[PDB]
Ligand binder design. Sequence first.
Ligand SMILES: CC(=O)N[C@H]1[C@@H](OC[C@H](N)C(=O)O)O[C@H](CO)[C@H](O)[C@@H]1O[C@@H]1O[C@H](CO)[C@H](O)[C@H](O)[C@H]1O
Ligand code: ZN
Length: 884
Amino acid sequence: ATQEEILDAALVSGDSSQLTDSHLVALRLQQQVERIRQTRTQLLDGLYQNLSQAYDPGAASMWVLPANPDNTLPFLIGDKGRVLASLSLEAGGRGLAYGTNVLTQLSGTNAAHAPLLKRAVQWLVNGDPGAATAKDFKVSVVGVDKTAALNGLKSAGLQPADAACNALTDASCASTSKLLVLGNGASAASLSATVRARLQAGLPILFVHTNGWNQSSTGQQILAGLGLQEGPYGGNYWDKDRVPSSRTRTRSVELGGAYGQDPALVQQIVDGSWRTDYDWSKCTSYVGRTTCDDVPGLSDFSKRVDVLKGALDAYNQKAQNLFALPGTTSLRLWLLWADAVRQNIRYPMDKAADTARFQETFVADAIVGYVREAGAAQKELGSYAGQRQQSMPVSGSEETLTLTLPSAQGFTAIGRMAAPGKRLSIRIEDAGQASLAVGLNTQRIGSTRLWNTRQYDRPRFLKSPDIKLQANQSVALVSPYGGLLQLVYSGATPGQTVTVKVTGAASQPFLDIQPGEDSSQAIADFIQALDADKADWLEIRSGSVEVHAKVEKVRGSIDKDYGGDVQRFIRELNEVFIDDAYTLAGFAIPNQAKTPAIQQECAARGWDCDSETLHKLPGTQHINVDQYAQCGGGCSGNPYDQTWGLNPRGWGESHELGHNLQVNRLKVYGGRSGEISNQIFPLHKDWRVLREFGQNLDDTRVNYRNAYNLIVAGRAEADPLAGVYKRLWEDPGTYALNGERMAFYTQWVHYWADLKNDPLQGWDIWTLLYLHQRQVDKSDWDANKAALGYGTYAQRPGNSGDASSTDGNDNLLLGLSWLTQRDQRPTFALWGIRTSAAAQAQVAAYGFAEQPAFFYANNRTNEYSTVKLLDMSQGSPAWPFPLE
Ligand SMILES: CC(=O)N[C@H]1[C@@H](OC[C@H](N)C(=O)O)O[C@H](CO)[C@H](O)[C@@H]1O[C@@H]1O[C@H](CO)[C@H](O)[C@H](O)[C@H]1O
Ligand SMILES: [Zn+2]
């Protein structure tokens, strides 16, 4: 079959599998867009003629926008570009929608609109804005006041008659009525469908919004019946847009034809007239990542491409199949064009060396329609994936999966993949109250380094839009890239399950650790899948951590750090990385009790240390492992991004995990500890690692020596608190004095160990503070405050993360004093940390002997045997380890 014949077919079926001739599609699109422009311009010009286009809807009005651009268009666009009234040719009918009740203002505010309105009604009734309506033409008015409506029309020089029946709901009435006027008081079954069916059978409809700047569902449903849509929250309130008396015929005609359409971009595709002179010297670079926001012209180009993406992604988000929805030919053609471009793409591309291919591909990446019965695979996947992904076998039979949502909001991996260019079908059941969508992949936008020299080597948008699902309703998907399937949720109940039924998906290697239970079976299945080597991507679920990983990066890490020992890699991922962190934070981990020393401290303290209400595991933290990251070679977030692979003993891994587990009430001076209070997690791991294994990792992070220097010198000032504050916590830089500030956090580790007379117990102090803090955060205040050393507080304390707040300092002073049973203000002052009066008074009330100022000094981070205790109450001893 010819390319021509394939395109004709695909316009109906959506199947772009054989469609390769993108210039052919571009030409068809060129003419489609041109005839839309012709239709629109001829209509508008016949409406406006040379009459005044003055129209002012006030702030108490809504914007009314086209939705289906092929068969709807604006009528009145304001000087600020707000669409204040739209026309509809949907289903071959005729309609018109205003964002306010214009009919009640035709002898007042909008007296000057009357002649234009007359032509508009002439058009509605006759199909010709120049053909007089007959005297006493029958008008049905529904959902808005009849007499005022009819009087308005009469004010415009028209002679309507009350049809005296309801043309919205009575079919006999519709067939004899010449116009229907709708407002938002209307009642009907299937309001949108009803409206559509009347339109399509030839009843002309005039809609007025009757709720000012408020939105109306009734209206939205009427508008959707016309192929229109209500504007955003607020309506015209803020902008107060209008069309002035000076607006010309030529100008409005022109805006109307051009609205939501880009014939210049289509021409550029056709001719291949891509820009050869972009000034790249204006790109800039930040931690290895080039961006080009300030290259003249570039943002306007990219923002025009964003229009098309938004347009098609609205269909993706609502799980709507474009090829099943009538009057979508322009967008079908954009989509089929884009799929044809994907047939030819080749990597890598450079912004300078490959101007034509770069810019066309740029446009094509932004146009992907996932909801469909058939479609094509992009041929080259470059730096994302390869031949393995292309060839993954798929399940012909239906597969049933059960998933647990650990928090109320987020996403979790389903455990299956879409294969490139192959239909899968999906539905979810037993969802309770949870709101649900499906999506593909986890890459963040900066992960495609298209502005880096010769690094446009993968698609811009590997992460699909979230595609909304209904309880018990199937959706058919085709991805050109293939991808890891994600269940996106909100409004869920921590610990609830969801059931996923999927047909046509592939099975990536997937390590699914089951909470508490023996996961011996799952580990060997995973290894077998890994050894089978059919996938470019894998995933891991363990505890509250999910890893979305490029297979070869993981192999590379197993090989370099574990000599190919997969089993040890997995164990250490689960135990030394994951369990280590979450156990240190005192969470309730299934089938895993607290250590004896912690259990016994919680007992003596009479605290709730194990309930799910207070200490349940938190929301999923996601980790990406890939060739690129969103920023740098590793980037904070959820997911956080890694490019080196995945090392269970890695500093980065636990540093970032730490960010997820930070809490403001354990931050010294708020953001001053933004990159400090998370470091207890990597620090704990390295201390454990040296003891159990022998590797000595990152042994110079904690700068006891220079922290000391700063303390000693800030201390000789007249105000010793402030003196130390200036030298330690004042500097607002993101990583300022990182090693020195960390030394504060370990003080309490060495202290607790001496207090418990057991070096193995030191870190328990932080685990007790986390448990204390969650009680402080969410326990019933009146009932629990006495047990938490907060009896003097009428109300729960604040949780400000602000540098100038004492919310973090206070709780640290209270918690440490309460747990240690000593008044710790001297050592807090020694570190330049101020506290509120309330907190001061509360410590006094404990009636503990003061702990005089002290300092734990060491010349190594990970090895505590050599730590030395200084008494700082009487003066400042010499640093107790020799230089140099
Ligand atoms: C403060 C800290 O612990 N930083 C380490 C952290 O940084 C994560 C992001 N990349 C970031 O926010 O900057 O994890 C990385 C990667 O795993 C490093 O260990 C960071 O330590 C810093 O490493 C770089 C070298 O890449 C420099 O030597 C810095 O001096 C060092 O602090
Ligand atoms: Zn950080």
